[PDB]
Amino acid sequence: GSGYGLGLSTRTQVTGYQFLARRTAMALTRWRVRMEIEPGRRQTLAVVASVSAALVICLGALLW
Amino acid sequence: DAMRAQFMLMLDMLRETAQESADSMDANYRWFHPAPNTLAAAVGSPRMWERKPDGKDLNFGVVRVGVGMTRPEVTWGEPQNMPTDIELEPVTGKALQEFGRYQSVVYNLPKMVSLLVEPWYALVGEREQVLGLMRAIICQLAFSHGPDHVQMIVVSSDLDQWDWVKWLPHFGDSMVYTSVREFAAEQAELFAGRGSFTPRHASSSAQTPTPHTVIIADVDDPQWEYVISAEGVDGVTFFDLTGSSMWTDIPERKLQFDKTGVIEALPRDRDTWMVIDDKAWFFALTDQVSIAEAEEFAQKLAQWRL
Amino acid sequence: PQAVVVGVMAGEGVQIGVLLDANAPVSVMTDPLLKVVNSRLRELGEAPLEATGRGRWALCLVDGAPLRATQSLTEQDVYDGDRLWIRFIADTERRSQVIEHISTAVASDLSKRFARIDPIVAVQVGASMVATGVVLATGVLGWWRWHHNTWLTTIYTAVIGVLVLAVAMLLLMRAKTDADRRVADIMLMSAIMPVTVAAAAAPPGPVGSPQAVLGFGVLTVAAALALRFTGRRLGIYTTIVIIGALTMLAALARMVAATSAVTLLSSLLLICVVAYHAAPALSRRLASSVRDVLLQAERARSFLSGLLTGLGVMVVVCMTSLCDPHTGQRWLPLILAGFTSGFLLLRGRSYVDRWQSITLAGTAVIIAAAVCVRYALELSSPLAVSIVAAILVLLPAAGMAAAAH
Amino acid sequence: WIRFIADTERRSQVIEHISTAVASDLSKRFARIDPIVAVQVGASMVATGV
Amino acid sequence: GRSYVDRWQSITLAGTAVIIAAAVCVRYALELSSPLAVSIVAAILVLLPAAGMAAAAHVPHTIYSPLFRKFVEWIEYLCLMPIFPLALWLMNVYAAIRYR
Amino acid sequence: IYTTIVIIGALTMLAALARMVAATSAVTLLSSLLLICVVAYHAAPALSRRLAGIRLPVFPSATSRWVFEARPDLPTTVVVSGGSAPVLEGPSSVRDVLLQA
């Protein structure tokens, strides 16, 4: 096949795939591709911020 | 990502434009070439015997044989300043490529054969497939064209298959034969007098004489060589239902049927009917009618006169 | 046997009796048959049947399914006295449609085959949540009563009842469509529950016989009054009226004087037994000119489905209470339950309506199962549970097998 | 068609009017129970016991 | 829930959020049963779902300014940020580490 | 209905297993499940994509230039029990999309 298997890849192919993955994900929950604003990104970043804030406090206790 | 997203959104608006143009072609093709089972109800309507030979009517001598793929009426212009292969972005590169591969053809449209294009059309396959399509061709011709424009003759040994032909007016005269020796005495005396085949076109249709002749060969008699090796005569068209070697030696005149009823033939241009390739390929999914259905339609048509 | 007489339906509703050839194939008849129905309509002065664009004429059953064009009229299950329909069915041939980019294609297709949320459904969900909410509040208020039968329960519940009822009042008087009426009905249905426990919670002292009488009384009155003024949701209100009225009598008797529960339980069983026999008569008496027949038919059906259901609740509650596995002739209530189950199992199948016949049939199965489970938990033993499981699993399996085999 | 007309033959020749839409609708909307449904009911009952 | 357009998918998310409140209210009344507790619980259990029907009926036919719509969006993110810092606190992790 | 069973089964198995191999505490097992669920709600739409077999092809045009005039894929023929007469639906590549979604 053309795209099958486990061959080499590049950086543009890695971001390109993540773009298609975001665009197709909202199509399953909102049924539209217009993507005026991209809320999937924001809802994920808010979790990463939560985890980071927990680690800062957790590491702050060890310093004490 | 913002550049990528803008390209995707613009590409889909072009999709809607093609889909809109495709809807128009579907309605037009059905309106001129309906399915054979719908013809019985339409017999009384003014759509019957509507076709004219006087040059402007482009559908004269054209008959519906089934369904398949065809080129839409859209005409694609190449993208200016295309980046080189090493410079192409992966997401938009494959998108513009697959878009071109699918939106360039429209699926499940009615396919046709033209009587004005070849001296004969050899039908090669099992008997049921060959006769199924032939009866469909006969009733389509009979519904769309009047007896003053089309006449039909059958030469066959299996008269039990051609019994229904009795009712149709197009088989009359101002007519089924058992062998070429019989046909040669009655019919060939008239037709052998002049000409040879000449592929025609819409504008030329105004000059050819009004009664076009369709001849059905179902006897496998070797005596047919005289007219066939002479490249026919103008105003005639033969359908070989047997698959004899004299008719089957020309790919440009051979229709091959798969076990699934799929027909293969050489590809021909939609607007000029000229052959565009020498290798046979998929042509149409066959539509067919039974003897009962044919006689039912024939009886309905037998009710009307000029 | 050479021909059969059947009724043929034609355009806009004319039924014509015809004597058809019983062995010719149906496709041979549809053409001249169309001519005949048209000729009669023309003489009658009506408009004939006509085709529209692309399609075909077919002969179908009253349910619209077409008959196989090649089969004989005797080959199909068409008998003398039946009826058929001549109909026009349009051409379905159209171009196929394709979208290759998977992201767009998933949105397009998924939006055409399913339904999205809308403001109309949002309000119905909201109404359902408040109804579910208030019954939880009355529950905790009604639970506190078993340990503190003070004024708090009635004072707190009374204001809730008035407030819910006041809202439903404005909605009922403003509703314009059935969508609006369902919202109001769900709101009204919920108002009966707080007022019931509010009234029953008024008489002081330890809760029991004297308190119960008020609750079942007001419940019976309120359900009946709501039906009388509203004229909708007959089934749910009627079922409450039956259980309410019957319980009120039993509550009054026990409060005044009763030698034993068995006496009241036996009395209730007997009252329901006679009611099961009288059920269709009660329904019949409780229930431009053509409309008069249509309205009455469904009204009677509505009252009957609730009646048969309510009686079922009473007998299952009563029988499960009577079948004690320790007291006296332990076998007596078991055989009595058997006789009771047999009557319901034998008579339930005689009813014409599906839900009425199905609900009656199911009422017997639950009684048998409930008795079996009671004899399992009480007087527990390893052999008993083993025996119970075998009986409990084979009983319904046998019922299914008798129908499936 | 060619047919044998016995002396006893008499024909109805009478027609009646009712909209086919209502006739077909009411036929499906309310009718008696079928064994196809009873299989589902029986299956549901046995599942409950186990 | 408003991120989902399907009828049953959105209703399940809203229902899940409401049932969590109801289930905690009941638990808080049976145990530690008292006149104030039952009095407070009984009010919450009817006003909370009532405010829901009120909002559901009025929101679809009104107009809101961009500044307010942007404000409701941020409430979701402000609700996610504290879950992890609070859960680890409930698990006593910060005290455990500080005292090794 | 089956998917619901798998999730409560899998997450409860990991809960009981922790309690089996180590004493730990209930509060910790409950709090840990809560955090696993909060992140799971964010993964749900992506996790649901792969289970349904949706695949996203990505490659630099097969290391070749585009062939706009390529011969299109052959349309598939389908039949029905009652509708025994076959009719062609369309390209096999596009029919799956209507099921996968």
Residue numbers in the entry:
A (entry chain B5): 10 to 73
B (entry chain C2): 101 to 274, 285 to 416
C (entry chain D6): 18 to 304, 344 to 461
D (entry chain D5): 102 to 151
E (entry chain D5): 404 to 503
F (entry chain D5): 253 to 353
What do the study's own words say?
The intact machinery comprises EccB5, EccC5, EccD5, EccE5 and MycP5 with a 6:6:12:6:3 stoichiometry resulting in a 2.32-MDa complex that is anchored in the inner membrane through 165 transmembrane helices (TMHs). The membrane assembly is best described as a trimer of dimers, in which each dimer comprises a single copy of MycP5 and two protomers each of one copy of EccB5, EccC5, EccE5 and two copies of EccD5. We show how the 2.32-MDa ESX-5 assembly, which contains 165 transmembrane helices, is restructured and stabilized as a trimer of dimers by the MycP5 protease. A trimer of MycP5 caps a central periplasmic dome-like chamber that is formed by three EccB5 dimers, with the proteolytic sites of MycP5 facing towards the cavity. At the membrane level, six EccD5-dimer barrels (each of which contains 22 TMHs) together form a circular raft with an inner cavity. Within this raft, inner EccD5 monomers are situated closer to the centre, whereas outer EccD5 monomers face towards the periphery of the membrane complex. Instead, coupling between two neighbouring EccD5 barrels is achieved by the N-terminal loop and α-helix of EccB5 that run parallel to the cytoplasmic side of the inner membrane and engage in interactions with the TMHs of the neighbouring EccD5 barrel in a clockwise manner. We fully resolved the twelve EccC5 TMHs in the intact M. tuberculosis ESX-5 complex; these form three four-TMH bundles, each of which belongs to the EccC5 molecules of one dimer. These bundles are held together by hydrophobic interactions and effectively seal the central space of the membrane complex, which is enclosed by the EccB5 basket. The entrance to the putative EccC5 pore widens on the cytoplasmic side, where the EccC5 stalk domains expand radially. Together, our data suggest that the six EccD5 barrels provide a stable scaffold for assembly of a secretion pore that is confined by the EccB5 TMHs and gated through three EccC5 TMH bundles.
